From a paper:
The arsN1 gene encodes an N-acetyltransferase that confers resistance to arsinothricin with high selectivity over the related antibiotic phosphinothricin. Here we show that ArsN1 acetylates both AST and PPT but with higher affinity for AST, indicating that ArsN1 is an AST-selective N-acetyltransferase. PpArsN1 forms an asymmetric homodimer in solution, as shown by the extensive interactions of the subunits and size-exclusion chromatography, similar to related N-acetyltransferases.
To elucidate the mechanism of PpArsN1 resistance and its selectivity for AST, we solved the structure of apo- and substrate-bound PpArsN1. The side chain of Arg77b in Chain B also appears to cover and move away from the substrate-binding site, allowing substrate access to the active site. Arg75 and Arg77 from each subunit appear to form gates that controls substrate access to both catalytic sites.
Residue numbers in the entry:
A (entry chain A): 4 to 179
B (entry chain B): 4 to 167, 169 to 179
């Protein structure tokens, strides 16, 4: 049925299992080392101190997650946000990914952010099309910018526009 | 006479005087408050312990400078570097900018870097010229991504290529 909720440091194990083959076997993440539960736990709670972090469950088991993160480091940038959506290594397609974004994106819009950015490791025709369907506009590509698993990978960036005027500080997310 | 050399923490004073207007009056940097000299001093040292940091002197005074910094945090981004060049306002469109690069790019090449990116705030004909007329390729723009001095600013990224085994990158000497 794929129900959706805010993640908590308890799901850290299940998330860390979704992440393992993504790090070890793919170029979706550029992390070259699988993180531990102890630090996976930390990331969840550290994210939730400012950004949302969502989990998808099926039959009482996490089969995908999605989170928001800082785009760049200075204050002039605090209305851009980086969105990350991962799904299980078996059944999701897109799929669970679109259900995740359809919750995550609105929250973001309602928090005060102006543009959401997603970086895809090309080639990725599937994820590419999903973002375009959602209404992400392709804004550029950093070619050969990353070397993981004995290969150079082009990384394209898609932008989601929220729309606004006047300006005022983006707002956080509800506690645990 | 335009002598180019590696920077030293003594340069912090004349570097602040160049950077500050940029901070105050432009979107060239998105930093909004001016760092102290003692702060600038630390950035020079901290940069130099891995990346090249250069300065351009003329008649004894610094009139420009340049550095490189990490592009993105993770390991796979090891071979990518960002490049940054600032000249004094009274030397805009004088040539120090390009001369600064001609030292800097080769250094990066022989350090083992694969590509170099410069982020340009975008109402800048002068800057885009220098980069494109230096072999940089425009690879994309991040529209209205940043807000400073009561205005949203577009930011476009230009890329310089070196060539292509994949052995890890290498640092810079102290003194």
């Amino acid at each position: 049925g794929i129900d959706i909720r805010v993640a908590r440091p308890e799901d850290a194990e299940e998330i860390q299992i979704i992440y393992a083959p993504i790090v070890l076997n793919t170029a979706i993440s550029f992390e070259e080392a699988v993180p531990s539960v102890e630090q996976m736990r930390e990331r969840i709670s550290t994210t939730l101190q400012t950004y949302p972090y969502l989990v998808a469950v099926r039959e009482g088991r996490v089969v995908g997650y999605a989170y928001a993160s800082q785009h760049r480091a200075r204050a002039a940038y605090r209305w851009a946000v980086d969105v990350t959506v991962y799904v299980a290594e078996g059944q999701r397609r897109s799929g669970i990914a679109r259900q995740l974004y359809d919750v995550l994106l609105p929250v973001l819009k309602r928090l005060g952010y102006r543009s959401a950015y997603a970086g895809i490791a090309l080639p990725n025709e599937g994820s590419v099309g999903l973002h375009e369907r959602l209404g992400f506009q392709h804004i550029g590509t950093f070619p050969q910018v990353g070397f993981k698993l004995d290969a150079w990978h082009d990384v394209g960036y898609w932008r989601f526009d929220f729309g606004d005027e006047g300006l005022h500080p983006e707002a956080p997310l509800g506690f645990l």
